[PDB]
Amino acid sequence: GMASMRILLSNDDGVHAPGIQTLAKALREFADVQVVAPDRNRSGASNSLTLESSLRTFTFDNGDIAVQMGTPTDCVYLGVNALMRPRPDIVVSGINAGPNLGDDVIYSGTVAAAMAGRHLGFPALAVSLNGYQHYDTAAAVTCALLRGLSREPLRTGRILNVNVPDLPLAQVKGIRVTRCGSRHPADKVIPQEDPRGNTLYWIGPPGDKYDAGPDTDFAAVDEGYVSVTPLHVDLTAASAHDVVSDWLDSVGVGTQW
Amino acid sequence: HHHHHGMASMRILLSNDDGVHAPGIQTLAKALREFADVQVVAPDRNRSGASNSLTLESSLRTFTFDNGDIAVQMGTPTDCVYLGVNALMRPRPDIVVSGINAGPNLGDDVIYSGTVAAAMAGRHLGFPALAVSLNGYQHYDTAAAVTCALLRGLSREPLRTGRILNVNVPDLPLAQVKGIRVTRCGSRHPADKVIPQEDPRGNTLYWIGPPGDKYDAGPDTDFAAVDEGYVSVTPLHVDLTAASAHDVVSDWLDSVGVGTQW
Ligand SMILES: [Mg+2]
Ligand SMILES: [Mg+2]
């Protein structure tokens, strides 16, 4: 090999989490790896960033950096811009304890860290295990995608959201290029009272699967395939443009007549 | 004949990410209260940059003020709307309005926006959710006026397609606002600045820098519209799929023998 791959590895479960550590070990067999991860579990962090306060880092013995109270996007931000010199080739996020599928991915901090590395030399990898058993399987899948990214460049798509079925590698049927599924709106809130009679509120479970069709990420994983979905950060709903414009004319907003 | 038909014709969950004490939400609450049934459910402090984050491993505590505003303690903007819609409000809201935010929410910044995230949690409602941000800190009244027009608009006719509208208002007196444009999100160069700062014990702490330079500010972007003095309205969705990359990724995989044997 003419060049080593330099990987900024991050996650969302925290620097000590089994996921990030199993993958770290796997990647280190053939790549330079720098972990920059949250100091504790930050699931549900989405693409949040720390703007109101400065961030404190702690470096471990194996060279791992943890950002205290830092979101996954903080980590990737500091890794790319300040802490890795030169900047990394690519960001790998994961392996996450649990799936990031369908319309849940906008809340995923795992995905968020991958999206913060979208402007690097290789497309970012978000890697989630559909469970907690086979981190080894997901590490193998990642190492394969990294191998694949260096045999031939991926020309389009700055983010690959990867979901790995929780099976031993031998039982994974393969890989499907998929689109994000969708859910019926979530509406469950679990209230619990405190000792003083005050009502406190837990955010309940996701909504029921709604678009879990054959071409979706929900289906692929259910059928034992690694789901790969190219993602972007553009949130424009382009198909709604005309309807919105016509509506405005229709109700006289922005126009005199 | 009055400017609005009815004093409390729609139920509005009003939120933000600047917090309940922010002048932007407060100015807007006043304005909306002329014609709407308004319930504020917002964070207890400034949560700018909170994106679509939520509190999952902890239950949430709410605090109610004398005027009836609810602040969710520790709560994210998504937390607030999620709680407001699903638990706190009787009767349920017809629409979520989020803002007015201090500062723009434009381009690829929208995914990092707590203002936008709050609207997005109201996307399943009767009316499309509105995210409203001011391009500055001066003319909250203008943004308020624009929001009231959009809302009177919804009373005259429903918006069919489009679940969330991201609205950016030029920081100008209303008379100087050239009008409105339906835009697409522009984009920026990644931010690259990291401002270091030493603590009293002499340890180096880091600040996230400002956003990157504009990259894509074409004629029909949200960036252009605002720069040119127009209110920008971009319809958004929560879906992150990059559909126009499907075939390239599939060919690529096949080409590199990942997922197949040969
Ligand atoms: Mg996690
Ligand atoms: Mg704000």
Q: What is the nearest CA distance from B137 to chain A, expressed in angstroms?
A: 18
Helix (H, G, I), strand (E, B) or coil at A155: coil
- Chain B residues near residue A189 by CB distance under 8 angstroms: 82-83, 86-87
- Cα–Cα distance, B82 to A17 (Å, whole number): 29
- Cα–Cα distance, A250 to B7 (Å, whole number): 23
C-alpha of A123 from chain center: 13
> DSSP readout, A85-133?
SS--SEEEEEEEES---GGGTTT-HHHHHHHTTTTSSS-EEEEEESSSS
Which residue in B61, B149, B191 is closest to A200 by CB distance?
B61
Structure tokens at A113: 């860290």
C-alpha of A218 from chain center: 15
Q: Please write down the HEC assignment for all residues of chain B.
A: CCCCCCCCCCEEEEECCCCCCCHHHHHHHHHHCCCCEEEEEEECCCCCCCCCCCCCCCCEEEEECCCCCEEEECCCHHHHHHHHHHHHCCCCCCEEEEEEEECCCCHHHHHHCHHHHHHHCCCCCCCCEEEEEEECCCCHHHHHHHHHHHHHHHHHCCCCCCCEEEEEEECCCHHHCCEEEECECCEECCCCCEEEEECCCCCEEEEECCCCCEEECCCCEHHHHHHCCEEEEEEECCCCECHHHHHHHHHHHHHHCCCCCC
Q: What is the nearest CA distance from A114 to chain B, expressed in angstroms?
A: 13
Rg (CA), chain B: 20
Q: Could A152 and B256 be called an inter-chain contact, meaning their C-beta atoms sit closer than 8 Å? A: yes
Q: Where are the domains of chain A?
A: 1-257
Tokens 């010199």 -> residue:
A85
Q: Say which DSSP state A79 is in.
A: I
- Chain B residues near residue A49 by CB distance under 8 angstroms: 49, 51, 112, 208
- Chain A residues near residue B159 by CB distance under 8 angstroms: 243-244, 247
Of B188, B183, B179, the C-alpha closest to B166 is B183
Of B87, B80, B78, B70, the C-alpha closest to B54 is B78
Which residue in A106, A233, A234 is closest to B238 by CB distance?
A106
- Chain B residues near residue A186 by CB distance under 8 angstroms: 82, 86
Domain A1-257 fold is Stationary-phase Survival Protein Sure Homolog; Chain: A, (3.40.1210)
Which residue in B51, B85, B249 is closest to A157 by CB distance?
B249
- Cα–Cα distance, A100 to A102 (Å, whole number): 7
Q: CB count, 10 Å around CB of B176? A: 10
- Chain A residues near residue B255 by CB distance under 8 angstroms: 152
Q: What is the nearest CA distance from B162 to chain A, expressed in angstroms?
A: 5
- Cα–Cα distance, A142 to A220 (Å, whole number): 17
Structure tokens at A23: 């993958």
C-alpha of B35 from chain center: 22
Q: Could A177 and B250 be called an inter-chain contact, meaning their C-beta atoms sit closer than 8 Å? A: yes
Which residue in B53, B62, B189 is closest to A44 by CB distance?
B53
Which residue in B59, B150, B187 is closest to A201 by CB distance?
B59
- Cα–Cα distance, B113 to B250 (Å, whole number): 32
**8 Å CB contact between A145 and A111:** no
Instruction: Tell me how the structure was determined.
Output: X-ray
Q: What is the nearest CA distance from A21 to chain B, expressed in angstroms?
A: 22
Phi, psi of A75 (to 5 degrees): -55, -55
> Counting beta carbons within 10 angstroms of the beta carbon of residue B257, is it exposed (0 to 12), middle (13 to 18) or buried (19 or more)?
middle
Of A154, A203, A208, the C-alpha closest to B121 is A203
Task: Name the CA dihedral angle for B155, B95, B3, B7, rounded to a multiple of 10 degrees.
Answer: 110
The letter for the amino acid at B112 is Y
**8 Å CB contact between A122 and A91:** no
For chain A, the helix, strand and coil percentages under 3-state DSSP, each to the nearest 5: 30, 30, 45
The letter for the amino acid at B26 is Q
Cβ < 5 A residues, ion ligand 2? B 17-18, 48, 101
Domain B1-262 fold is Stationary-phase Survival Protein Sure Homolog; Chain: A, (3.40.1210)
**8 Å CB contact between A205 and B151:** no
Let me know how long chain A is: 257
Ligand nearest to the CA of B56: 1
According to DSSP, the residues that pair with A96 across neighbouring strands are A128
Starting from the edge strand earliest in sequence, which strands make up the sheet with A124-129, in order?
A56-59, A65-68, A31-38, A5-10, A90-97, A124-129, A159-164, A225-231, A174-177
Alpha helices, DSSP H, located in A2-108 = 18-28, 72-78
According to DSSP, the residues that pair with A216 across neighbouring strands are A179
- Cα–Cα distance, A61 to B26 (Å, whole number): 50
Alpha helices, DSSP H, located in A102-229 = 109-115, 135-151, 217-222
Ligand nearest to the CA of B104: 2
**8 Å CB contact between A161 and A126:** yes
> From the CA of A54, how far away is ligand 1's center (Å)?
23
What b/e string do you get for A104-140 counting C-beta neighbours within 10 Å, with b at 16 or more? bbbbbbbbbbbbbbbebebbbbbbbbbbeebbbbbbb
Q: Could A47 and B112 be called an inter-chain contact, meaning their C-beta atoms sit closer than 8 Å? A: yes
CB pairs under 8 A between A and B: 255
Of B190, B187, B171, B196, the C-alpha closest to B222 is B187
Q: What is the nearest CA distance from A166 to chain B, expressed in angstroms?
A: 16
> Counting beta carbons within 10 angstroms of the beta carbon of residue A41, is it exposed (0 to 12), middle (13 to 18) or buried (19 or more)?
middle
Of A26, A1, A42, the C-alpha closest to A150 is A1
Q: CB count, 10 Å around CB of A84? A: 17
> From the CA of B46, how far away is ligand 2's center (Å)?
7
Q: CB count, 10 Å around CB of A58? A: 11
A-chain residue closest to B247, CA distance: A177
> From the CA of B19, how far away is ligand 2's center (Å)?
8
- Chain A residues near residue B234 by CB distance under 8 angstroms: 235-236
Task: Name the CA dihedral angle for A76, A100, B61, B66, rounded to a multiple of 10 degrees.
Answer: 80
Best of A101, A177, A192, A217 to disrupt the B interface (most B CBs within 10 Å) is: A177
Q: Could A203 and B245 be called an inter-chain contact, meaning their C-beta atoms sit closer than 8 Å? A: no
- Chain A residues near residue B206 by CB distance under 8 angstroms: 54-55, 57, 78, 82
**8 Å CB contact between B131 and B181:** no
C-alpha of B230 from chain center: 18
